[PDB]
Design a protein around this nucleic acid. Structure first.
Ligand SMILES: [Ca+2]
Ligand SMILES: [Ca+2]
Length: 220
DNA sequence: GAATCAGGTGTC
């Protein structure tokens, strides 16, 4: 309903939101949603279909590699910027979920906007839904992991699976709980088998060795 | 759905 005020001044406004910033595995997902024919139900009082039939949508992704090289915050806007880019209508303005985000289109940030703007409310759905059906095929591809349930998140299951099964190249290797399970041994193997770029290989080395450092200081 | 447990990272 706040979405309506912005449309009056800027005309074509979009909604951005992301999913999967707290995961241990997978990319981060973003979604950009221009929308006209209004939908009751999104931030009001089976709309997946209505949103698809009745809106403009761009989706962006950042590979887990990219979360590890760039970091979880930058990888996010990287996807978000790819969403606007993948969106078919150029908006004059954007309402982003969160705070402290500057995107390639002039915009404003809304705290709990995924819960007060319809355009963001839309993309936030789009985002999860895609991510979810993505984690699904990850589950099929990596049968050992219940990706289809925990969504790559840091649940008790997912951890046990990592511990019992080993880390994957689709794990965010710079993520504390994954990191703490990491041996350069594996890194090397991942590298040698061509399952990680040299860039990532280095980064993670530098990171492990830095993890030891703060423990070393902290032990003194 | 609202609470309440759990687990992630980022900027100021
Ligand atoms: Ca939220
Ligand atoms: Ca979201």
């Amino acid at each position: 309903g706040i979405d309506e005020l912005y449309k009056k001044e800027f005309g074509i406004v979009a909604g951005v939101d992301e999913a999967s910033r707290g995961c241990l595995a997978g990319p981060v997902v973003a979604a950009a949603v221009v929308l006209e024919k209004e939908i009751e139900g999104i931030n009001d009082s089976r709309l997946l279909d209505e949103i698809m039939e009745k809106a403009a949508v761009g989706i962006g992704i950042a590979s887990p590699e990219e979360i590890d090289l760039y970091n979880i915050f930058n990888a996010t806007k990287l996807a978000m910027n790819r969403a606007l880019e993948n969106l078919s209508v150029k908006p004059s303005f954007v309402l982003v979920d969160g705070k402290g985000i500057e995107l390639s289109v002039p915009g404003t940030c809304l705290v709990k906007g995924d819960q007060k703007s319809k355009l963001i409310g839309a993309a936030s759905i789009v985002a999860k839904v895609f991510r979810d059906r993505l984690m699904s095929e990850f589950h099929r591809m990596y049968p050992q992991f219940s990706f289809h349930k925990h969504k790559g998140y840091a649940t008790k299951e997912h951890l046990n699976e990592i511990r019992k099964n080993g880390v994957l190249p689709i794990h965010r290797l710079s993520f504390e709980p994954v990191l703490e399970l990491l041996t350069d041994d594996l890194l090397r193997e991942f590298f040698e088998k061509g399952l990680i770029s040299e860039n990532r290989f280095e980064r993670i080395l530098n990171l492990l060795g830095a993890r030891k450092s703060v423990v070393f200081r902290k032990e003194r």
